[PDB]
Design a protein around this ligand. Structure first.
Ligand SMILES: Nc1ncnc2c1ncn2[C@@H]1O[C@H](COP(=O)(O)OP(=O)(O)O)[C@@H](O)[C@H]1O
Length: 296
């Protein structure tokens, strides 16, 4: 069961006042066996599905879950594994890609605001608004195609620009959080060494190499720039109301376990329950059964 897991999970939450060194302080691989994790993961997925059903039936809340990671951290597989357990009618996964021409004619939050979950729904942001302080920070020339960014030469970008953005993001998440949205953000943290192992494995297998983009190496070459961006992001946009969690990503079964456990534990704070049947509704059910029974 969950005895020690419960305490370890709490260490993964980024506290608001905390400073962040991903190299030193957050292990990309870490208590239980893999066999035990797999069975515990299957309970977590079943509980999450019961929570989803209660949320959908009478929740006064919506749920927004964010995933961000470096390439080959296992994001896509984690998202998939979570979905397989859940009902499609109350859960929507939006995978955010390079902005379209229309999206670039709007502020960088617009396409995310558009996709927010409705009351009783779980929205999964597979990549998110945080892209606007990650890939665009490493590659500030993308800011030049953003008609709304106010950036005409990359020389203009400095720490005040990112600070301003952290303030906008926090104000956005605070607003939706004050209007019924439970927001959970996950950073899947893969080591450089494990990323290389996975890249090479994908290059060598005909079942995956048709899918491999050699562009991923170019982003790996910016590892330190990405690390700086993640650290600054985590240090400034984790709040008690909208927390970040840093999840070790080098063992995939453990990644998934941790995320399922954290989502269940956080949503259990809502004290959701299934609707109950009043005496009046009980009489109606019984009258319906009597009618079926009386049928010619
Ligand atoms: N706001 C953004 N600005 C620029 N690029 C973005 C933005 N949001 C997402 N992207 C980029 O879109 C790409 C999506 O890559 P893709 O292979 O389709 O998906 P994934 O890697 O999530 O499975 C990533 O390179 C990501 O950095």
């Amino acid at each position: 069961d969950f005895s020690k897991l419960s305490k370890y999970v709490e260490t993964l939450r980024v506290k608001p006042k905390q400073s962040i060194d991903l190299k030193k302080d957050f292990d990309t691989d870490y208590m239980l066996t893999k066999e035990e994790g797999e069975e515990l993961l299957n309970l977590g997925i079943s509980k999450l599905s019961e929570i989803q059903e209660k949320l959908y039936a009478s929740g006064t809340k919506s749920v927004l879950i964010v995933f961000q990671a470096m390439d080959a951290a296992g994001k896509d597989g984690t998202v998939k594994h979570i979905m397989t357990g859940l009902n499609p009618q109350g859960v929507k996964v939006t995978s955010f890609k390079v902005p379209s021409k229309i999206e670039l004619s709007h502020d960088y939050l617009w396409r995310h605001y558009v996709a927010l979950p409705a009351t009783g729904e779980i929205g999964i942001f597979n990549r998110s608004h945080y892209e606007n302080v990650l890939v665009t920070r490493v590659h500030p020339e993308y800011l030049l195609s953003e008609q709304t960014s106010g950036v005409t030469a990359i020389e203009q970008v400095n720490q005040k620009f990112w600070d301003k953005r952290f303030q906008q993001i926090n104000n956005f998440e605070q607003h939706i959080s004050e209007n019924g949205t439970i927001v959970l953000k996950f950073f899947l943290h893969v080591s450089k060494k494990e990323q290389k192992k996975r890249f090479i494995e994908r290059i060598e297998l005909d079942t995956k190499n048709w899918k491999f983009s050699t562009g991923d190496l170019k982003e790996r070459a910016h590892w330190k720039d990405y690390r700086n961006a993640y650290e600054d992001m985590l240090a400034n946009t984790s709040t008690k109301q909208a927390p970040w969690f840093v999840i070790p990503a080098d063992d995939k079964w453990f990644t998934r376990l941790l995320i399922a456990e954290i989502i269940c534990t956080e949503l259990e704070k809502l004290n959701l329950t299934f609707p109950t049947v009043s005496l009046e509704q009980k009489a109606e059910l019984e009258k319906a059964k009597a009618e079926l029974v009386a049928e010619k």
